[PDB]
Design a protein around this ligand. Structure first.
Ligand SMILES: Nc1ncnc2c1ncn2[C@@H]1O[C@H](COP(=O)(O)OP(=O)(O)OP(=O)(O)O)[C@@H](O)[C@H]1O
Ligand SMILES: [Mg+2]
Lengths: 357, 21
């Protein structure tokens, strides 16, 4: 059988090809004994007191190989429960990943785990392949990085990619910060979870930000209540959309980036003029941080206004967009016509990690 | 110059309904 594994800063979604949903979903963290012997995932989170925590993937790029090596070990043996020697493994990388990083992924896959074969693809491509498409621009928005990724006939256009170094993680802080600013106490990492649960259950993108500011002030209709595990009722009103707006107006945390809507526009205008129309109608979204209600609506509005007045603009926000990366990699890796794309061990033995190119 | 077109076809034609649960 073929394995599918998506390596995020935030979450390692894993499982088997031909499945519609990953069996293993866990934080992307290696833990080691602080003093005086190692855990991965939810077991590294639950024992964060006596273990030194680490995010080997931060911002999409694998930064430390021993840690990520421990996280691949754990994916095989604990979460999935497989012998890696007998399964093709499709691994996903970030956009604009350095060659050296991509060479090291292959070198390690054939040499530590001795896979029968492997392939690497690009997340954005995989969320496109999931929606039925091979052309278009994908908004990929995870825990620690965000991307615009244009794609023509199956392939990402590297020179036209755009990156926003702000994702779900940054919107949690900002919220945490904002509720703090209003009398509340949210310091430790382990209180963060509360705020994150506030962020996901309750936050939303304002279709128009100033109308919405006007609405939250003139009425109680947008006020929400959430009950801490300690007993207090936090009533949030405008916090609900002020948090996610940071995607479109990042200077809410002090950045210089334009929002995900201009970067969607730029990333289209660095493309062949004749493919542009196809991007505009195929603007698919993906990642947990694109899960906010009203995002594809607000995107539509912002692009319409940036794009010539007659341009058909369609934004696709598949209801399962949180897993599309993996869902695309599951589909890809089982089709009959992909099977001879796998780098085999013997191609590798004769060519080296540079074959991955 | 041959590998793409068939993969494109399987990819665009795929029914996700075909994926196990
Ligand atoms: N229902 C939801 N609504 C809004 N945001 C969410 C929701 N669920 C998860 N998120 C946010 O998205 C992030 C996880 O998304 P995802 O699994 O796409 O990230 P990832 O691939 O690990 O990101 P990276 O590519 O940096 O690794 C978390 O920060 C989480 O707060
Ligand atoms: Mg991701």
């Amino acid at each position: 059988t073929a394995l599918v594994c998506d390596n995020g800063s935030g979450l390692v979604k894993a499982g088997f090809a031909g499945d519609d949903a990953p069996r293993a979903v866990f934080p992307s963290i290696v833990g080691r004994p602080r003093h005086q012997d190692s855990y991965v995932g939810d077991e590294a989170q639950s024992k964060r007191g006596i273990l030194t925590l680490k995010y080997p993937i931060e911002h999409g790029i694998i930064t430390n190989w021993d840690d990520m090596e421990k996280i691949w070990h754990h994916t095989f043996y604990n979460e999935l429960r497989v012998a890696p020697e007998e399964h093709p493994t499709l691994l996903t990388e970030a956009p604009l990943n350095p060659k050296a990083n991509r060479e090291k992924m292959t070198q390690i896959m054939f040499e530590t785990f001795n896979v029968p074969a492997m392939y690497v693809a690009i997340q954005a491509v995989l969320s496109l392949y999931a929606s039925g498409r091979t052309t278009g621009i994908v908004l990929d928005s995870g825990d620690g990085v965000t991307h615009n990724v244009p794609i023509y006939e199956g392939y990402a256009l590297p020179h036209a990619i755009m990156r926003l170094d702000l994702a779900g993680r940054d919107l949690t802080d900002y919220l945490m910060k904002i509720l703090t600013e209003r009398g509340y106490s949210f310091v430790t990492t382990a209180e963060r979870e509360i705020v994150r649960d506030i962020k996901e259950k309750l936050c939303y993108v304002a279709l128009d930000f100033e109308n919405e500011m006007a609405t939250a002030a003139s009425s109680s209709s947008l006020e929400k209540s959430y009950e801490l595990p300690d007993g207090q009722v936090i009533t949030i009103g405008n916090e609900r959309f002020r948090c996610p707006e940071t995607l479109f107006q990042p200077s809410f945390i002090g950045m210089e980036s334009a929002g995900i809507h201009e970067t969607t526009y730029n990333s289209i205008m660095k493309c062949d003029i004749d493919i542009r129309k196809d991007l505009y109608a195929n603007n698919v979204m993906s990642g947990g941080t694109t899960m906010y209600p009203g995002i594809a609506d607000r995107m539509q509005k912002e692009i319409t206004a940036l794009a010539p007045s007659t341009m058909k603009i369609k934004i696709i926000a598949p209801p399962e967009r949180k897993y599309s990366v993996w869902i695309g990699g599951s589909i890809l890796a089982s089709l009959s016509t992909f099977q001879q794309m796998w780098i085999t061990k013997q191609e590798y033995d004769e060519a080296g990690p540079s074959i991955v190119h | 110059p041959k590998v793409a077109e068939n993969l494109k076809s399987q990819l665009e034609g795929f029914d996700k309904s075909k994926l196990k649960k």
